[PDB]
Every structure is written in structure tokens, then in C-alpha cells.
């Protein structure tokens, strides 16, 4: 299968990237180095993950080694919720750039639609545990993202965890200058996202599937459904002489999605890349879709009253 998808900014995005949430800072430099050595050309990052400096060390070393050229990499990061303010967006982007050892990002996303009170804390709470909102809306935040394109800091801008109506808000913005290139959302067989995907794809927005393996290392896991252990998925894998993870990665690829599995295990980083030499049948695809149960890895009770919280 073709390795890249065309975005609505004219650039091409690798359909398979390496996730970095939860990758320990003492492991992620090697993980990214290994990933680039074995063929990854897309790394998914975020300031809130607290490991961009270490991701950047890997990127810079592989550029310096001339393993890759900068033009061949596709580096994604995300604006955290406490930086939804006109006067904070550029500096947030620049901190990410400085940490990643880059002079531009290929794609910069609004990480969540909700803005929070600025300050040192990533989740400022009131004394009853509710997140403290910012008054700044997604349209004004989008305008600030557009400025980053116009300043050369980012080649593409997009959104993440935006629901149907929030995507529509963005698309209907008065004076919209750049459409979102991508909406990055949770997507896997237990949360198949058909409705949001069809909306987004119909508008030309590329969808990236996060937590494609069901985020088994998520910190709030309970002893919960498990994609990797689901014998029905294991059976499809066995039929194709592939691992369950490889099936879970190939699945979104055949839906015209980008997918960003995370690993810090070198053998798995390599395993997860070996997904371009087999095809799931239409029956396999429909069977995997049938496992939907509307189950989310990423949700957060403290944020559910924010006006712009995306999920119900």
C-alpha cells in the first residue's frame, strides 16, 4: 500500500507514525532512533507529553547522521489546552519547535477543543476538582493557528478530539483562511467512529486514529476490554499470519486513515511497521467494524462540564 496520503494543504503525510504519549524520557530517544532506522517517517508528539526534548534529540541525531532528510520527515505536535489564547499560541508552538530541534512542524493540532486557564498547571482545577476554563473559543484559537502557517512555523494545521459540530464550526468560521488538514481522534475496533470519520472525510479532512491498540498502558486502565487479547481479532491475525497488533494497525490504514501506534519496545516498533505487505478482506474489515462498543480510552471526568468538552 502507498505510504502517504495527500492533505488539503498539498503536502503528503505518512499513514503510519510513531506515537509518543507515555514513552518514558529515558527510552523515547532510542525508540525514535530505532523507528527512523526501520522506516518510520512520521512522529506524533505533544508538549503535554513532557518528552519532546528527548524526541527531538533522536530526530536531530538522525538528521545529523543523514539517515533522513528533514523534508522526508513528518513531525506532528499539538497546542495544549492552557495555551488557547491569542498571545500564547506562538510561544507554545515555538517551545515545541525548540524542544524538537526543528524550524517548522509538518502539522500542528489543537490538542483538545477546550481551552483552560493559563498557568504552570496543565489541568488547572477549582477547589471541587472541575477544570478551570478559558473564555477563548475554538474559532479564535483557529485564527491563531492560521497565523502560525503565515509565519512559517508550521506547514499544516489541524484539530484533535473535535466532534462533528466542532469540526463544522471550524469549517463555517467567518473568514476561514485555512481548513483543518487533519482531525486526530481515538479510533479502533471498539470505538469505530464511522459517523465522525464519514463527516470528516466528506469534507476532505484526513483522520488520524490514535490509541489504535486500545492504549493498554493508559494510566487509568482497569483489569476493561482488551483489543490485543480479543480472540476474534487474534483469529483474523492468525489467518493472515500476522500479529494482532499488525491487524489493528492495518485496519485504519484500509479506511483511509493515518494511524500512530505507540511503542518503546524496539522489536514492536519494527513489528508495527511491517503492515505494507498484506491486505484485510472487505469481510475482515466489516467484521472488525462490527466490534464497536463505543469504548473510549481518552475521556476525562474533570473536564466534562467545560462548554467545549467534545464527548457525551
Ligand X SMILES: NC(=O)C1=CN([C@@H]2O[C@H](COP(=O)(O)OP(=O)(O)OC[C@H]3O[C@@H](n4cnc5c(N)ncnc54)[C@H](OP(=O)(O)O)[C@@H]3O)[C@@H](O)[C@H]2O)C=CC1
Ligand Y SMILES: O=C(O)COc1cc(F)ccc1C(=S)NCc1ccc(Br)cc1F
Annotated binding site for substrate: 111
Q: How far is the CB of 114 from ligand Y (least distance, A)?
A: 4
Separation between Cα atoms, residue 251 and residue 268, nearest integer Å: 17
* Residue 108 binds which of ligand X, ligand Y, none (CB < 5-8 A, kind-dependent): none
40 is a catalytic site residue: no
Note the maximum CA span of the chain: 54
Measured from the CB atom, is 75 or 233 closer to ligand Y? 75
Verify binding: residue 132, ligand Y, rule CB under 6 A.
no
Label the pairing between strands 18-19 and 107-110.
unpaired
* Residue 225 binds which of ligand Y, ligand X, none (CB < 5-8 A, kind-dependent): none
Verify binding: residue 162, ligand Y, rule CB under 6 A.
no
The CA-atom distances, in angstroms, between 130 and each of 125, 133, 149, 208, 305 are 5, 9, 34, 29, 8
Residues at the binding site are 10-19, 111, 211-272
Q: How far is the CB of 208 from ligand X (least distance, A)?
A: 8
* Terminal alpha carbon distance of the chain: 36
Residues at the binding site for NADP(+) are 10-19, 211-272
Verify binding: residue 190, ligand Y, rule CB under 6 A.
no
Nearest alpha carbon to residue 46 among 13, 86, 118, 95? 95
Beta strands in the chain (DSSP E): 4-6, 12-14, 18-19, 42-44, 74-79, 107-110, 157-160, 182-186, 206-210, 258-259
Q: How far is the CB of 185 from ligand X (least distance, A)?
A: 8
Q: What number of other Cβ atoms are within 10 A of residue 123's Cβ? A: 16
Q: How far is the CB of 174 from ligand Y (least distance, A)?
A: 25
Verify binding: residue 125, ligand Y, rule CB under 6 A.
no
Q: Contacting ligand Y (CB under 6 A), which of 38, 228, 270, 299?
A: 299
The binding site for ligand Y (CB under 6 A) comprises 21, 46, 48-49, 112, 114, 298-300, 303, 309
Which residues are annotated as catalytic?
49
Amino acid at each position: 500500500m502507498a505510504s502517504r496520503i495527500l492533505l488539503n494543504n498539498g503536502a503528503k503525510m505518512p499513514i503510519l507514525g510513531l506515537g509518543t504519549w507515555k514513552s518514558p524520557p529515558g527510552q523515547v530517544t532510542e525508540a525514535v532512533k530505532v523507528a527512523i532506522d526501520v522506516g518510520y517517517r512520521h512522529i506524533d508528539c505533544a508538549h503535554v507529553y513532557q518528552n519532546e526534548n528527548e524526541v527531538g534529540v533522536a530526530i536531530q541525531e538522525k538528521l545529523r547522521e543523514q539517515v533522513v532528510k528533514r523534508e522526508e520527515l513528518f513531525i506532528v505536535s499539538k497546542l495544549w489546552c492552557t495555551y488557547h489564547e491569542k498571545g500564547l499560541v506562538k510561544g507554545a508552538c515555538q517551545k515545541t519547535l525548540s524542544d524538537l530541534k526543528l524550524d517548522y512542524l509538518d502539522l500542528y493540532l489543537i490538542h483538545w477543543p477546550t481551552g483552560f486557564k493559563p498557568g504552570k498547571e496543565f489541568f488547572p482545577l477549582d477547589e471541587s476538582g472541575n477544570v478551570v476554563p478559558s473564555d477563548t473559543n475554538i474559532l479564535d484559537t483557529w485564527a491563531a493557528m492560521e497565523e502560525l502557517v503565515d509565519e512559517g512555523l508550521v506547514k499544516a494545521i489541524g484539530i484533535s478530539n473535535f466532534n462533528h459540530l466542532q469540526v463544522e464550526m471550524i469549517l463555517n468560521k467567518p473568514g476561514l483562511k485555512y481548513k483543518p488538514a487533519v482531525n486526530q481522534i481515538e479510533c479502533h475496533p471498539y470505538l469505530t467512529q464511522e459517523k465522525l470519520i464519514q463527516y470528516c472525510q466528506s469534507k476532505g479532512i484526513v483522520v488520524t486514529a490514535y490509541s489504535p491498540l486500545g492504549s493498554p498502558d493508559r494510566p487509568w486502565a482497569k483489569p476493561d476490554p482488551s483489543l490485543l487479547e480479543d480472540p476474534r481479532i487474534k483469529a483474523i491475525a492468525a489467518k493472515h499470519n500476522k500479529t494482532t497488533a499488525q491487524v489493528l494497525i492495518r485496519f485504519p490504514m484500509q479506511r483511509n486513515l493515518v494511524v500512530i501506534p505507540k511503542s518503546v519496545t524496539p522489536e514492536r516498533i519494527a513489528e508495527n511497521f511491517k503492515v505494507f505487505d498484506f491486505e484485510l478482506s472487505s469481510q475482515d474489515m466489516t467484521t472488525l467494524l462490527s466490534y464497536n462498543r463505543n469504548w473510549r480510552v481518552c475521556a476525562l471526568l474533570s473536564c466534562t462540564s467545560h462548554k467545549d468538552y467534545p464527548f457525551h
